[PDB]
Amino acid sequence: LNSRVKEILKENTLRSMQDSLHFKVKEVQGVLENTYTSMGIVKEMLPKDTKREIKIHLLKNFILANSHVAGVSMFFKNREDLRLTLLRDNDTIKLMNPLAQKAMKNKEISKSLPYYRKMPNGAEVYGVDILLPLLNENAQEVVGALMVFISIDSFSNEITKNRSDLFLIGVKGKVLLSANKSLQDKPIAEIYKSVPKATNEVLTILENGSKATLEYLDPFSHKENFLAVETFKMLGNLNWMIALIIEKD
Ligand SMILES: [Cl-]
């Protein structure tokens, strides 16, 4: 049978891979729908006819209350006095946007591309911004806006601490985080040039927002791998995805 069973063994493995991965994905999700809420609080309170001294603490608290959050920032249309921008030194520091606007012009909220933000010590952090229009007591008029800078790098906790077999992949297939940092901000279609059968199945699932398994010769290991991949809407509409690889052995 050694092939009848090599094939049942395969099934056994991919099943538990997807089980594990599905847990890995649940993890990373609730770490952000917690924030989007622990956030959200913030949206309603801030635009209160309260004071700059008040709101700072409000924001300075919400950063502290969300590890993977690395900064925030505030605007108010003609009340220009109310600009400010708080970031990560190891406490917060105060330092010194057609999307922010755009989502005011909506009252729907939006995200950005991943990008690298230089930080008060000098260090550059990969992250996305999450915009959040600020609106009036009646909520038919647009006040200012908020901006929460989510460190993608902060998720090495979930992604790369003591394992190195997971990948976080965001839009059109750009590796967002991975044990090897050479890959951050490069798209899978070029990292894995060698296996378009594979990257086209991954880019497809990403688009459709689903899960699958498959195999590919890895170009770093030079050996065949099993791959399980699974998606989730990063705000709680477009997908991020996590990948879990296992060398056949
Ligand atoms: Cl993304």
GROMACS .gro file of N, CA and C in nm, residues 69-151:
model
  249
   69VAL      N    1  -0.043   4.844   1.771
   69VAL     CA    2  -0.057   4.984   1.732
   69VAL      C    3   0.070   5.060   1.766
   70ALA      N    4   0.121   5.135   1.669
   70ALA     CA    5   0.250   5.202   1.680
   70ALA      C    6   0.237   5.352   1.669
   71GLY      N    7   0.122   5.404   1.630
   71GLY     CA    8   0.100   5.548   1.632
   71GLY      C    9  -0.045   5.577   1.601
   72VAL      N   10  -0.082   5.707   1.612
   72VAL     CA   11  -0.216   5.760   1.578
   72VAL      C   12  -0.207   5.908   1.539
   73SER      N   13  -0.317   5.965   1.487
   73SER     CA   14  -0.313   6.106   1.447
   73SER      C   15  -0.453   6.161   1.416
   74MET      N   16  -0.469   6.291   1.440
   74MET     CA   17  -0.599   6.355   1.454
   74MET      C   18  -0.603   6.484   1.375
   75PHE      N   19  -0.722   6.518   1.325
   75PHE     CA   20  -0.745   6.638   1.245
   75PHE      C   21  -0.883   6.694   1.279
   76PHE      N   22  -0.903   6.821   1.247
   76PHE     CA   23  -1.029   6.890   1.270
   76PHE      C   24  -1.034   7.010   1.177
   77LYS      N   25  -1.143   7.023   1.102
   77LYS     CA   26  -1.137   7.091   0.972
   77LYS      C   27  -1.081   7.233   0.982
   78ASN      N   28  -1.148   7.321   1.056
   78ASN     CA   29  -1.101   7.458   1.072
   78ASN      C   30  -1.035   7.482   1.206
   79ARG      N   31  -1.062   7.394   1.303
   79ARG     CA   32  -0.995   7.391   1.432
   79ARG      C   33  -0.852   7.338   1.420
   80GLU      N   34  -0.775   7.392   1.324
   80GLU     CA   35  -0.638   7.344   1.300
   80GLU      C   36  -0.557   7.331   1.428
   81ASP      N   37  -0.595   7.400   1.537
   81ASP     CA   38  -0.523   7.381   1.663
   81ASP      C   39  -0.518   7.236   1.705
   82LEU      N   40  -0.610   7.154   1.656
   82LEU     CA   41  -0.632   7.019   1.706
   82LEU      C   42  -0.554   6.912   1.627
   83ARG      N   43  -0.457   6.951   1.544
   83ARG     CA   44  -0.361   6.857   1.487
   83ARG      C   45  -0.269   6.799   1.595
   84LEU      N   46  -0.216   6.680   1.568
   84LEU     CA   47  -0.128   6.608   1.660
   84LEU      C   48  -0.102   6.469   1.606
   85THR      N   49   0.000   6.405   1.658
   85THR     CA   50   0.054   6.287   1.595
   85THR      C   51   0.141   6.221   1.699
   86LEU      N   52   0.099   6.105   1.747
   86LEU     CA   53   0.162   6.039   1.859
   86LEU      C   54   0.216   5.908   1.805
   87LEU      N   55   0.338   5.873   1.846
   87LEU     CA   56   0.413   5.763   1.788
   87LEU      C   57   0.488   5.690   1.899
   88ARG      N   58   0.562   5.587   1.859
   88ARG     CA   59   0.622   5.487   1.945
   88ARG      C   60   0.771   5.518   1.959
   89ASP      N   61   0.812   5.561   2.078
   89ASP     CA   62   0.953   5.564   2.115
   89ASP      C   63   0.980   5.445   2.206
   90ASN      N   64   0.902   5.440   2.313
   90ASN     CA   65   0.885   5.326   2.401
   90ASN      C   66   0.792   5.370   2.513
   91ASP      N   67   0.775   5.501   2.523
   91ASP     CA   68   0.646   5.557   2.553
   91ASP      C   69   0.597   5.620   2.422
   92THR      N   70   0.501   5.709   2.431
   92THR     CA   71   0.458   5.786   2.318
   92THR      C   72   0.543   5.912   2.313
   93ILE      N   73   0.562   5.966   2.192
   93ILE     CA   74   0.616   6.100   2.172
   93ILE      C   75   0.524   6.171   2.074
   94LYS      N   76   0.497   6.298   2.099
   94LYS     CA   77   0.436   6.385   1.999
   94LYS      C   78   0.540   6.436   1.897
   95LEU      N   79   0.503   6.432   1.770
   95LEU     CA   80   0.593   6.468   1.660
   95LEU      C   81   0.512   6.558   1.567
   96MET      N   82   0.557   6.573   1.441
   96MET     CA   83   0.493   6.666   1.345
   96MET      C   84   0.474   6.599   1.210
   97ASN      N   85  -0.409   6.481   0.338
   97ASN     CA   86  -0.402   6.336   0.319
   97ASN      C   87  -0.520   6.277   0.239
   98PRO      N   88  -0.508   6.272   0.104
   98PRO     CA   89  -0.627   6.254   0.020
   98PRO      C   90  -0.712   6.131   0.054
   99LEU      N   91  -0.660   6.042   0.137
   99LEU     CA   92  -0.739   5.929   0.184
   99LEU      C   93  -0.822   5.968   0.306
  100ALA      N   94  -0.759   6.040   0.400
  100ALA     CA   95  -0.828   6.084   0.521
  100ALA      C   96  -0.949   6.167   0.486
  101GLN      N   97  -0.927   6.276   0.413
  101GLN     CA   98  -1.029   6.347   0.336
  101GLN      C   99  -1.131   6.249   0.275
  102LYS      N  100  -1.105   6.198   0.154
  102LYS     CA  101  -1.181   6.088   0.093
  102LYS      C  102  -1.274   6.010   0.188
  103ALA      N  103  -1.226   5.959   0.304
  103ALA     CA  104  -1.313   5.884   0.396
  103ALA      C  105  -1.397   5.974   0.488
  104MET      N  106  -1.358   6.101   0.507
  104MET     CA  107  -1.449   6.204   0.557
  104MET      C  108  -1.563   6.213   0.457
  105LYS      N  109  -1.529   6.257   0.335
  105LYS     CA  110  -1.616   6.245   0.218
  105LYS      C  111  -1.665   6.100   0.202
  106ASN      N  112  -1.734   6.046   0.303
  106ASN     CA  113  -1.790   5.911   0.296
  106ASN      C  114  -1.857   5.872   0.426
  107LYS      N  115  -1.784   5.889   0.536
  107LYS     CA  116  -1.825   5.841   0.667
  107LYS      C  117  -1.808   5.690   0.670
  108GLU      N  118  -1.773   5.632   0.555
  108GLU     CA  119  -1.706   5.504   0.553
  108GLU      C  120  -1.557   5.525   0.575
  109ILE      N  121  -1.494   5.423   0.630
  109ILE     CA  122  -1.355   5.427   0.668
  109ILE      C  123  -1.273   5.349   0.566
  110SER      N  124  -1.141   5.371   0.566
  110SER     CA  125  -1.055   5.310   0.466
  110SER      C  126  -0.919   5.276   0.527
  111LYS      N  127  -0.841   5.196   0.452
  111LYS     CA  128  -0.702   5.163   0.482
  111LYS      C  129  -0.612   5.215   0.369
  112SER      N  130  -0.481   5.197   0.388
  112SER     CA  131  -0.379   5.239   0.294
  112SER      C  132  -0.307   5.117   0.238
  113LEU      N  133  -0.210   5.142   0.152
  113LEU     CA  134  -0.111   5.039   0.123
  113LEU      C  135  -0.022   5.020   0.245
  114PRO      N  136   0.040   4.903   0.258
  114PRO     CA  137   0.158   4.894   0.343
  114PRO      C  138   0.263   4.995   0.298
  115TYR      N  139   0.345   5.040   0.393
  115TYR     CA  140   0.447   5.141   0.370
  115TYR      C  141   0.535   5.148   0.493
  116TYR      N  142   0.654   5.210   0.476
  116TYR     CA  143   0.756   5.216   0.579
  116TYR      C  144   0.761   5.355   0.640
  117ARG      N  145   0.735   5.363   0.772
  117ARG     CA  146   0.728   5.488   0.848
  117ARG      C  147   0.849   5.497   0.938
  118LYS      N  148   0.924   5.607   0.923
  118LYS     CA  149   1.039   5.633   1.008
  118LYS      C  150   0.990   5.678   1.145
  119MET      N  151   1.056   5.630   1.249
  119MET     CA  152   1.001   5.645   1.383
  119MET      C  153   1.099   5.721   1.473
  120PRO      N  154   1.049   5.797   1.567
  120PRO     CA  155   1.134   5.887   1.647
  120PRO      C  156   1.276   5.843   1.682
  121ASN      N  157   1.303   5.715   1.704
  121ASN     CA  158   1.441   5.673   1.725
  121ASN      C  159   1.522   5.677   1.595
  122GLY      N  160   1.455   5.671   1.481
  122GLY     CA  161   1.520   5.656   1.352
  122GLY      C  162   1.477   5.533   1.276
  123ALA      N  163   1.415   5.438   1.344
  123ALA     CA  164   1.386   5.309   1.286
  123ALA      C  165   1.263   5.318   1.198
  124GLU      N  166   1.260   5.233   1.096
  124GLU     CA  167   1.153   5.231   0.995
  124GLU      C  168   1.064   5.110   1.014
  125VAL      N  169   0.934   5.134   1.034
  125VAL     CA  170   0.836   5.028   1.061
  125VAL      C  171   0.742   5.012   0.942
  126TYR      N  172   0.728   4.889   0.895
  126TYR     CA  173   0.626   4.854   0.798
  126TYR      C  174   0.488   4.848   0.864
  127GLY      N  175   0.390   4.916   0.805
  127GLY     CA  176   0.256   4.908   0.856
  127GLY      C  177   0.159   4.957   0.751
  128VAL      N  178   0.030   4.949   0.786
  128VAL     CA  179  -0.082   5.016   0.721
  128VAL      C  180  -0.137   5.121   0.817
  129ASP      N  181  -0.206   5.220   0.759
  129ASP     CA  182  -0.290   5.314   0.831
  129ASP      C  183  -0.436   5.273   0.816
  130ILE      N  184  -0.514   5.297   0.921
  130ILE     CA  185  -0.658   5.278   0.919
  130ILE      C  186  -0.719   5.413   0.947
  131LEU      N  187  -0.791   5.467   0.850
  131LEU     CA  188  -0.860   5.595   0.865
  131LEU      C  189  -0.998   5.572   0.925
  132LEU      N  190  -1.052   5.677   0.986
  132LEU     CA  191  -1.179   5.668   1.058
  132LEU      C  192  -1.236   5.807   1.061
  133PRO      N  193  -1.333   5.839   0.975
  133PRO     CA  194  -1.389   5.974   0.974
  133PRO      C  195  -1.446   6.009   1.111
  134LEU      N  196  -1.433   6.138   1.147
  134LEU     CA  197  -1.489   6.191   1.272
  134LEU      C  198  -1.607   6.280   1.241
  135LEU      N  199  -1.719   6.254   1.308
  135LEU     CA  200  -1.852   6.299   1.264
  135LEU      C  201  -1.928   6.360   1.382
  136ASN      N  202  -2.040   6.424   1.350
  136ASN     CA  203  -2.106   6.507   1.449
  136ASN      C  204  -2.207   6.430   1.535
  137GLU      N  205  -2.247   6.495   1.646
  137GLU     CA  206  -2.340   6.434   1.741
  137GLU      C  207  -2.458   6.370   1.668
  138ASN      N  208  -2.509   6.440   1.567
  138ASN     CA  209  -2.617   6.387   1.485
  138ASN      C  210  -2.564   6.294   1.378
  139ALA      N  211  -2.436   6.309   1.340
  139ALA     CA  212  -2.362   6.219   1.254
  139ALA      C  213  -2.397   6.237   1.107
  140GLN      N  214  -2.463   6.348   1.072
  140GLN     CA  215  -2.485   6.388   0.934
  140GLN      C  216  -2.384   6.492   0.885
  141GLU      N  217  -2.289   6.533   0.971
  141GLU     CA  218  -2.186   6.629   0.934
  141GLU      C  219  -2.050   6.579   0.981
  142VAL      N  220  -1.947   6.615   0.905
  142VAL     CA  221  -1.815   6.555   0.913
  142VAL      C  222  -1.720   6.649   0.988
  143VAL      N  223  -1.664   6.600   1.099
  143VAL     CA  224  -1.593   6.679   1.201
  143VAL      C  225  -1.445   6.693   1.163
  144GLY      N  226  -1.368   6.584   1.185
  144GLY     CA  227  -1.231   6.567   1.138
  144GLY      C  228  -1.200   6.426   1.086
  145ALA      N  229  -1.101   6.357   1.145
  145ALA     CA  230  -1.068   6.218   1.112
  145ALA      C  231  -0.960   6.169   1.207
  146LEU      N  232  -0.944   6.038   1.211
  146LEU     CA  233  -0.848   5.969   1.296
  146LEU      C  234  -0.769   5.871   1.210
  147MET      N  235  -0.657   5.826   1.264
  147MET     CA  236  -0.564   5.749   1.184
  147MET      C  237  -0.491   5.663   1.283
  148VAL      N  238  -0.497   5.533   1.264
  148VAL     CA  239  -0.430   5.441   1.354
  148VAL      C  240  -0.330   5.366   1.271
  149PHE      N  241  -0.205   5.375   1.310
  149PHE     CA  242  -0.097   5.319   1.232
  149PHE      C  243  -0.069   5.181   1.289
  150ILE      N  244  -0.107   5.078   1.214
  150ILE     CA  245  -0.090   4.939   1.255
  150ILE      C  246   0.045   4.888   1.204
  151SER      N  247   0.135   4.861   1.299
  151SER     CA  248   0.261   4.794   1.269
  151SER      C  249   0.236   4.652   1.221
   0.00000   0.00000   0.00000
